[PDB]
Enzyme design. Structure first.
Site, PDB file in Angstrom:
ATOM      1  N   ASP A  73       0.837  -1.224   0.000  1.00 64.12           N
ATOM      2  CA  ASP A  73       0.000   0.000   0.000  1.00 64.12           C
ATOM      3  C   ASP A  73       0.856   1.252   0.000  1.00 64.12           C
ATOM      4  OD1 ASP A  73      -1.859  -1.978   0.536  1.00 64.12           O
ATOM      5  OD2 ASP A  73      -2.737  -0.962   2.286  1.00 64.12           O
ATOM      6  N   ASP A 243      -7.282   2.728   7.648  1.00 65.22           N
ATOM      7  CA  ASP A 243      -7.107   3.439   6.371  1.00 65.22           C
ATOM      8  C   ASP A 243      -7.702   4.863   6.337  1.00 65.22           C
ATOM      9  OD1 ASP A 243      -5.964   0.914   5.685  1.00 65.22           O
ATOM     10  OD2 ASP A 243      -7.524   0.465   4.218  1.00 65.22           O
ATOM     11  N   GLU A 335     -12.163  -1.412   1.457  1.00 63.63           N
ATOM     12  CA  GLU A 335     -10.883  -0.924   1.992  1.00 63.63           C
ATOM     13  C   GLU A 335     -10.425   0.356   1.319  1.00 63.63           C
ATOM     14  OE1 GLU A 335      -7.551  -3.668   2.307  1.00 63.63           O
ATOM     15  OE2 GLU A 335      -8.718  -5.174   1.306  1.00 63.63           O
TER      16      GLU A 335
END
Length: 538
Positions: A73, A243, A335
């Site tokens: 990520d 997140d 997500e």
């Protein structure tokens, strides 16, 4: 479209950010993914429409860190409008990294945030094949991120994803997920893991040789799952809470909002869905009943997208607001949400896996998207009400397999990309998870080629389409995360200028400008000359 249910009715109407309204990504909506798929697509071929399928990534890929670490990520430095920044001539990105000696699938419990940098303003033709990034190392010294947990008996402690807001003086507000695990040696939980949305402040220190970071010595605990809006570990051992992405909403100037991933706050074992979660039109012959869905196990998939509002301008205190999107009986995981603003609309993009879809549903790995007239709105899932914006090539007619075990009949690019992040102009960056077949596959842990998704095709805001003329047959530069804004600062005063202005300023001013940017002392007279000139181009 194959025969099947009609997608749900959504109005896109806006509500107040503080209102108790939550849009649903419904079962009727998600079943459009199956309608769009070609039931005749042979073994290992893509069954999904090309316009919503990511171009195929070559199995022969460069590694952005020369295999120093695993990388996944990744996020740029952003402002409140999500413009992406260089500082003093350097593009900077943050990434989750892990020790390359680990198996790639064991990265999660040893994850840390690292950073990369590369020169700003370099044309694509002049950029190295691997993206030209230099790995700058880890953001946090050992022990720093563990400070927020009352219970210090954790077996593992990690940093997971978020975002990074940059100021004109090169200050960085790093929003991230600070996580503690309490696991026996077999991997079983003593108690549920403890993921918290957190902030650490630091600063760019740049020179001609590269970028280092200062600060990042204290972490502020911002948010943890509450149990009324966002599911807790008591409610679900394997709850999602992570997140953070912060932004300013043009419709609400003066405020700062955050989206993040959660789950709907229902006790795992008694969670249920309702007619609105299913979302069928009146009389649709493909409608399911609430009882059948509730009996199916689909109730174990209850992901949501949260919203919070900052209580101060330092962004060190936050208030939860009601979720803006739920996917009850649809998916476990919505997500890395982001809000992306275009043509007066709010686009909510979120990523999801194939395996996380509820019983009876199916869809590719990739980015799912929704459009509305406000950040809290009755969101319309994109592309025929499906929600799919960009999927990996996927044969929905055969099982999906896993990134550690590809299925014999599945497209070799099924897991080629994850953590797709939509950048200004519809450019999309992602990391490579797995590429290859059952018998011959490789793991990535480096960034994919950047691709281009056109948002709002033919005047229709609900439609997206991959630009297959971008780069080489749709594939742009490896690990390309370009800055469209460019800061120059001595660490106190700062201005954003164009790359062409940057080059002219450097030529006019000469080496004394290098000294100014490096933080070196110059006379008050020289400093004022430089800053007045910078201000002219701001």
């Amino acid at each position: 479209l194959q025969d099947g249910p009609e997608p749900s009715i959504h109005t896109q109407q806006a509500y107040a950010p503080e209102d108790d309204f939550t849009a649903k990504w419904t079962r009727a909506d998600a079943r459009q993914l199956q309608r769009m798929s070609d039931p005749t697509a042979p073994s290992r071929e893509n069954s999904m429409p090309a316009s919503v399928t990511m171009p195929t990534v070559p199995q022969d890929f460069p590694d952005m860190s020369n295999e120093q670490v695993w990388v996944w990520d990744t996020w740029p430095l952003t402002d409140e409008d999500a413009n992406q920044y260089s500082v003093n001539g350097w593009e900077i990105i943050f990434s989750l990294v892990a020790d390359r000696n680990l198996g790639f699938d064991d990265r999660h419990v040893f994850a840390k945030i690292g950073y990369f940098y590369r020169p700003a303003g370099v044309p694509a033709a002049e950029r190295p094949e691997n993206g030209g990034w230099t790995y700058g190392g880890l953001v946090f010294k050992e022990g720093v991120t563990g400070q927020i947990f009352e219970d210090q008996s954790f077996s593992h402690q990690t940093q997971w994803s978020g975002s990074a807001r940059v100021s004109k003086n090169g200050e960085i507000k790093l929003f991230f997920t600070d996580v503690a695990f309490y696991r026996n040696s077999d991997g079983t939980n003593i108690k549920p893991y403890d993921p918290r949305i957190a902030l650490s402040v630091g600063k760019v220190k740049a020179n001609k040789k590269g970028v280092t970071l200062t600060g990042f010595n204290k972490v502020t605990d911002l948010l943890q799952a509450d149990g009324t809006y966002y599911q807790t570990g008591a409610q679900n051992e394997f709850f999602n809470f992570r997140d953070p992405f912060t932004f300013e909403d043009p419709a609400h100037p003066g405020e700062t909002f955050m989206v993040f991933e959660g789950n709907s706050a229902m006790q795992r074992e008694t969670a249920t869905c309702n007619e609105a979660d299913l979302g069928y039109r009146q009389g649709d012959p493909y409608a399911e009943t609430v009882d059948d869905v509730n009996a199916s196990g689909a109730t174990y998939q209850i992901g949501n997208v949260g919203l919070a509002k900052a209580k101060n301008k330092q962004l060190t205190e936050w208030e939860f607001l009601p979720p803006i999107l739920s996917a009850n009986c649809v998916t476990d995981q919505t997500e890395r949400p982001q809000i992306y603003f275009k043509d007066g609309k709010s686009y909510l993009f979120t990523i999801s896996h194939r395996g996380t879809f509820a019983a009876g549903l199916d869809g590719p790995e990739g980015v799912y998207g929704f459009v509305g007239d406000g950040i809290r709105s009755d969101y319309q899932p994109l592309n025929g009400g499906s929600g799919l914006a960009l999927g990996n090539p996927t044969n929905l007619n055969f099982l999906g397999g896993q990134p550690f075990a590809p299925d014999v009949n599945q497209h070799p690019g099924h897991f080629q990309a994850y953590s797709h992040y939509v950048m200004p102009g519809g450019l999309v960056q992602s990391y490579i998870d797995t590429i290859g077949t059952h018998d011959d596959f490789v793991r990535g842990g480096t960034l994919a080629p950047t691709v281009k998704m056109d948002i709002g095709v033919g005047g229709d805001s609900t439609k997206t389409a991959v630009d297959y003329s971008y780069g080489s047959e749709g594939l742009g530069g490896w690990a390309d995360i370009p800055a469209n804004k460019h800061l120059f600062t001595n660490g106190k005063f700062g201005v954003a200028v164009s790359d062409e202005a940057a080059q002219k300023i450097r030529k006019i001013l000469g080496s004394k400008f290098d000294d100014y940017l490096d933080g070196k002392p110059v006379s008050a007279t020289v400093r004022a000359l430089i800053e007045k000139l910078l201000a002219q181009y701001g």
